[PDB]
Amino acid sequence: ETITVPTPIKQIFSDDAFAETIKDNLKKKSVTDAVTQNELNSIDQIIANNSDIKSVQGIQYLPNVTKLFLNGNKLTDIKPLANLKNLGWLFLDENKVKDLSSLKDLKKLKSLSLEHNGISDINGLVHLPQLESLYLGNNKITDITVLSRLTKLDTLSLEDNQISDIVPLAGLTKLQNLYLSKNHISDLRALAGLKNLDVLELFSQECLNKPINHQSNLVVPNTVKNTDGSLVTPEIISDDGDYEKPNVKWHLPEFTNEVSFIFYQPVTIGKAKARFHGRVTQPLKEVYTVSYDVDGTVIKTKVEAGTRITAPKPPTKQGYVFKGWYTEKNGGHEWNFNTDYMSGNDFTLYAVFKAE
C-alpha cells in the first residue's frame, strides 16, 4: 500500500471524479501530474461532497487521513477505508453503504454520519463503542439493541426511521442531543433518566395498532405514555370521536376500515424542551356472524366478510341422511362453501335431512 516512484494521480485514483478531488486537495494542475508518497502522507482531510464519486479506490495509500467528507455521492463498497487507522470523522450521507463491517477496526473514529443510505442492519456498529457522534437519519432501522454498547455517544440522530423500542437508549446518560422524530415511538419511559439533554426532537410519531374487529360501539385503549408512564391526552380524534380516559371511543353506525387520533404533549427532560407529537392508527376488520342451526340449536362463529367460510363438521341424525346447509329452514337454496363468501351481514344456515 505504498508507491515507490512518482505516480500520476489518475493511475492511483481510478474514479475520474475522485481523481479531481485529489488533484484539488494537493493544488495540482492535472490528474495526470505525478505525486510522491510524501505528498500523499501530507493529506489530513478530504472534502469531496456532492462530487458524483462512485469509488474511493486508491484511498488506502493515504495512511494519515483523519477527516473524510463524502456526502452526496454514489458509493456502495467502502472496503478501501478498512485500514485508515487514524480516521476520526466520516460523513457518508446520501450514499448506498450497507456493509458496516469495513469499519470494525477504525478505533479512533469519533464521528460517523450515515443518513439516507437505506440501512436496516446496524449490528456492525458493535465494534465502535468509542463513537461520540452518530447520525443515522432517513433509513429503515427498526432494531437499535446494539446502541446500549455506545456509552460514549453525546450526539445521536435516529430521525425518520421505523423504531418503536427505544429501551436500549435508557442507559446512555451521556446523550446531550437526541433526534428521534419520524419514528414509531409511543412510550417515552426509556428517556426518563437522560438528565443531561439540551436538544430533543420527538415530532411525527406514527404508531400502528394491531387490527381489531369493527363494531358499532368501538373502544380502543390510549397507549401513548409520557416519561412517567402517564397517558398523553389526544390532540384531536377522527370521526367525531371522544376521549374517555383511559379509552378512546367512537360511534360508527357504518363500517369503516380505520379510525385514528393525533396527540400532542410538551416534554421537559433535564434542560431540554421537546414536542411529543404523533398519530395512532387503528385498522378495523368488517366481521359478521354465521349462525349454524341444527334442528333448533345454534352455534355462532365470527367470519370476515369477503372471506371463505370453513364448513362445520356435518350433523349426524339417526334414521336420516344429511343433505346440506340451506339458507332457510323450509325452502331456500343450499350454501356452497367453496364458492360462496361471507356476506356483509349476520345470517343463519339451516341443516336439512332427508329420509333413508
Residue numbers in the entry: 36 to 391
Sentences from the paper on this structure:
InlB, an invasion protein from the facultative intracellular pathogen Listeria monocytogenes, is a multi-domain protein that binds and activates the human receptor tyrosine kinase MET. The N-terminal internalin domain (amino acids 36–321; InlB321) is characterized by a central leucine-rich repeat (LRR) region that binds to the first Ig-like IPT domain of MET with high affinity. The LRR region is flanked N-terminally by a helical cap and C-terminally by an Ig-like inter-repeat (IR) region. The B repeat folds into a compact domain resembling a β-grasp fold.
Intriguingly, wild-type InlB392 was a much more problematic crystallization target than the InlB392_T332E variant. At 4°C we obtained thin rod-shaped crystals with a cross-section of about 10 × 10 µm and a length of 80–100 µm. In a way, the packing of InlB392_wt can be viewed as a slightly distorted version of InlB392_T332E crystal form I with a tripled b axis.
